[model samples]
Target: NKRVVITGLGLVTPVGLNVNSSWKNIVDGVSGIKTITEFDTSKLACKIAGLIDNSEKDGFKLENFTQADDINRLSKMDKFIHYGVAAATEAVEDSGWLPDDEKSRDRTGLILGSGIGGLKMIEDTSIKLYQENNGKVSPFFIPASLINLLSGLVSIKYGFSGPNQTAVTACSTGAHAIGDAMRMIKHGYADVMIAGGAEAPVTPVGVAGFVAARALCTKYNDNPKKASRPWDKDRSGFVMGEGAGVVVLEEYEHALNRGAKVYGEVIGYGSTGDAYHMTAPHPEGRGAYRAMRDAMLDATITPDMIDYINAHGTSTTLGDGIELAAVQKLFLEANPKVLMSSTKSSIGHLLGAAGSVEFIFSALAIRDQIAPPTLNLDTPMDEVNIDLVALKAKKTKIDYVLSNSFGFGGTNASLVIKSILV
Candidate 1:
């Protein structure tokens, strides 16, 4: 089997627009959650979220963009696609691929993971047609909002004739995107893959839908900084976040031959189905346990071998406990000593984009040999077994690390990453 490695990482997150900025915010414990400015939350129950700051409306910042479309077309895209396109551009740049370069262009591919296609697009288009009796929608509507177009645009702009695919598994989409891309290379589908996830569900309906489902934190509207208290006793629920996380992946020898800067190796990936509930995880975390086990097994590593984990701690009532149970089952006694983090507390929950960002964290941890902390875990839940690295980044030598992404519809996936020798 060909060894898989990550050569580049890009982020258009609520915290910051790039990787170093976002990771710094994460390590420095900066809270991106704030009052909703993109949408009018006057009538909604939840008014706080992690909205992008100072980013182009539809991510038309061409200095780092790949797609070539009119500004009007770009503006009509949903926020998710904007972040997605922007992140992909950054990933390609960081990976040292010039779309104009004929050789590198065709050998590249794209894989995108998105939880929801286009909430804002749907609402806006429906209102224009039905409420205003408009005859035509924006021409870019189909291309920009379609989840698969993420892959399409990347492929078209860069002339990447390789495999172009998209994965939609709610929150797990991002991890699955990377996992599937790695498989494609190892299986000879492509030599290089541009992959990750993006999400932009911080609209009026986005917040209202989750609030109506009783899955959001409404009490901390005034204290936006402290609103997303993941794994904390006073934690209410996850605050919605919007952004994108992306990576450039390549076959091991391919990257080495080109002398590309490698972050780490993608040694393992695991996935399973819950079949439990529409929005809730299984009570005993049986499904999560299976997913974790499968991921480690896929990596050909043991549970104790993992020194860190970027937990899927969404800060919801049942989510935190269930995930903890799963982790405990995987690690047993060693679980208590490993450095774990639920970064949702700082940047809210990016949903579809969480896995990609968390995967980047895992790779960086292996490269820098450090683990991030779970902000706002002041009073840890009694059922929580791991030493949740709380409110402070911890320095440690990490050999093996895992990142978990489990979403609605029983969708679960994990990525195992390890250090790669130069």
Candidate 2:
């Protein structure tokens, strides 16, 4: 097998704008959920969400994301693209492996995705047309909103002239992007790949749609920080979040020749479909179980080898329980000491970007030997004996970390990343 290692990481999450601050805040059990102040939420059932804080100078700034001259042109772009481009910039810069020659650039690729692209842009345009005329729509509307263009714009900016693709697998989008990128590198399609997911759905229609589907936590509206309580008895639903997470992955030999900083190795990737429901998970978590099993098999590791699991616990009633049940059946019987937690409790659910952001958290776990806590898991819903690291970070020896991500439409993806013990 051609080994793939992560050389750099970038993130623009609600909890933090960059990796260092985000990791510190996550390990400290900080919550980013808050009332929706960016827009009017008085008419919505759920009035809170995990929005990127742009109040600080170092926080999310649209002007800082794109080129100065292209600012006016790219400013009309959807927020998701802004986020993906920004994070990609950070990841590529952090990797310190930018190719100077055209041949080297030709071998680089990009795979980024979003579950729901340009919802806000569409909503705004629709209202504009309804209220005014067709001329209200901007010229960059299509390019700015299309999901594939997220990867296109990033590749164009970086001059990556290889496989350019995007995956729109709902909440599993980011995981699939990374998984697919791994396959691309391993199969000799590319030596370097920029892969991840981005999302910005905190708009009127976005919130209203989820609210109508009863997929948001409303009970804790008064206390936004405690709204996303995965594995808790009082958990309601997932909190909407917006941002992006990206990584730079290179072939092992390529990374070694350049002496790139290795964060971890992406040893396994598993993707599946529930083929059962549009919004609900399989009754018994069959898809999730199969995904994890396949990932372990791909990694050629047994259940006991996995040190930690970054769960896809979205705080929904059925989703959280089903994920736990699946993990219990798959790993607990063989490895009772495996640690598991949901970073969603801290950053809410990033939807399309959740998988990649959590995967970053998992990589950080392997690097620092500390597992971030599942905030607000005050009470256990099930009687499972697995160690759900709650309320505090745990310092433990970690070898292989398994991250799980399941999306709507019954899509599922799992990734096993191992520590590079040189």
Candidate 3:
């Protein structure tokens, strides 16, 4: 297999839009979370979210909204699809890979993932059908709501005639998307691939559903930005976030041939299943441990080689502890020694988009030599022996980053990104 490297990155995060803005805010440790202003939250238990800044108010036709407006045409796409298209557009633009070049155009492709695709759209259309008899469904509803729409739409947008696919694994969806694209390029299926994930779950029904499941945080109604307290002793539950993150992956030689600037090499990817719970991780974090260990092995790296880990610490009651145990067992680093963080503390959990956003976070950590803190940790968790990078991003020379993304149904994925210049 050939080595794969990231050449371009893009993000539509709660923190900011585009690479430069997002990177600056991330390193400065600015939180993008705020009260749930997208809709009325007075009736809901959770009053906050890491909502897209201008997602609804400006409409997808806003100056910030990238890509062809008529691409979806059906108006069936939820806000999530729009975010995905914007991020994908930004990523390809940054990568400087123009499909206008015959060879590159034929060899470039797209692979994006989403755990919950267009749930808001589905819920809204279903209500319309129920509320009004003979209400017609939009012909584009299927394309808009399908989890694979990101790849399909991206392929169409760029005329990418290469391999295109999507992964639907819960929160790990984004990482899996990138990993799959990496493999495709490495195995000669494609020369370059645009890969990442996007999500939008801030809708009324989205909130109601998670609240009914008791999976979201309801406290901190007074301070939405400070609600996601990962690894904090007073942590309650994960705050819902919506956004997209994307990256361009290309074969090492292919990137070199094109004189593209490389960001980092995706050396390893590991995925596993807990098989012990539906929504909760294994009590001992055995699955997370296995996933991390496998990723290290896949990357041919030692435990000592890891400098930072972007944790899947969603600030939930049991989540932070389980991840700590897993990290401790995997790295054998004592508290306040190991460097780890949960970007969700600032941006909120992005559901399917978590992995991709964290992936970009890790890559930026390597590029900028800084690690964004796990914001809102007033008091660290008892058993956690790692440095949360709390409150502020820290300066560091990161050689390798391990990003963890575990989701519902016991699925876990880990990626090892190395700052190798090959």
Candidate 4:
């Protein structure tokens, strides 16, 4: 089988702006969630969310990544694009494998996605037309807000022409982008691929919509950091999180010839569906079970070979427990000594970006040989027997790490990444 390895990593998360800062904070169990101060939340049920600091000098400065002349135009497209571009910039730069010739550039591709692209932009435009009764819209509206535009803009900047695509599998968007991109490289469609998910849904309507669906944690509005407590007994719902996570994947030989820094190897990918519900998971985690099982099979490894698992525990009542049931079953069948943790407890549920961001952390786990702590897991549920890695990072020998992502439309994706022992 052809091999694919991660050459670069980039993150624009609520916890930190760049890969360095985010990984540092993640290792320390710091929570990046807080009350929604970017906009008015007095009328909303879910008043808190995980948001990026737009005001910080080193954090989220759109002007830094874009030319001054282009800034004015992109500023109007939407916030999601801003994050997507920024993270992609960091990943490409970190990879240091920019193609200088036409042939090399043609062999590169990009795949970026979002759960709700230009949602805030849509809301703003809608309010404008309804309030002022103006039928005219901005010329850049469509291009700026389109989901494919995330890849379109990135490709335009980088000149990658192989396979430009996007996936919109709700919360599993990022995982799908990566899993499919791996195949693209392995099957000779592309030698290098920039793939992942980006999201900026921490808006008024974004929060309101989740609140309307009762999908947000509303009980801990007073104590913000304590809200996204996955596996804890008192968990309520997922917290809205915004940002982007992008990675550069290259064929093993391509990366080796250029001396690209290897993060880890993407060895396996599994995708399955619940075919059961729109928002609820299978009661016994049927889809989750098969997805993990399939990924291990794809990797040609047994259940006991997985060292750690980065769970898709979104902190909701049904989601966290249901995923746990799935994990427990798999582990009982299972990775008996494996330690699992939900980074969502610190960064909140990133929705579309969750899978990619958590996958990055999983790679880091293999890189550093440390399991990140599951913050706010004060009291773990009885249904779980895995370590859960609560409240503290664990130093352990990790070989293969499995990361899981499940979405609203019964979509689920699992990826098995193994450390390069050379």
List TM-scores for all candidates, in order: 0.95, 0.98, 0.95, 0.98
Clashes in model 1: which pairs?
none
Which numbered prediction scores highest in lDDT against the true structure?
A: 2
lDDT of 2 at 298: 96
lDDT of 3 by residue, 1-422 (tens): 99999998878888887778777877777888888776777789987888766765633442465434664452456767788888988888888987686677789888888888798889877988888878688777777788778788778778887877888898899998988888898799899999999998888988887888788888787888778999888888889898999899999998998799888999989989999988878998888899899998989988888888999989898878888888888787532355898889888999999999899989999988888888888888778666779888888868889999999999999999999742
- Candidate 4's residue-wise lDDT over 362-390, tens digit each? 99999999999999999888887879999
Q: Candidate 2: lDDT of 91?
A: 90
Residue pairs in candidate 2 whose N, alpha carbon or C atoms collide under 3 angstroms: none
Better of 1 and 4 by lDDT: 4
Give the alpha-carbon lDDT of every model. 0.83, 0.91, 0.84, 0.90
Q: Write the residue-wise lDDT of candidate 2 on 195-273 in tens digits.
A: 9999999999899999988899988889999988888998999999998999999999999999999999999999999
lDDT per residue for candidate 1 within 1-422, as digits (tens), equals 77889998989877888888888888888888888876678898788988778645743364446435444565667778878878887888898865567666666788887898788888777777787675877677676668887777667656887778888899898999999999988887778999999998887777889999898999988888888776788887888898999999999888988888988899888888888789888888887888888888888887778889998888888888888877887786755588788878788888899899889888887877888878888888887766788888898869888899989898899899888862
**Residue 73 miss distance in model 1 (angstroms):** 3.5
Q: What is the lDDT of residue 348 in candidate 2?
A: 90
| Model 1 whole-model lDDT (C-alpha atoms) | 0.83
Model 2's C-alpha root-mean-square deviation from the true structure amounts to 1.2
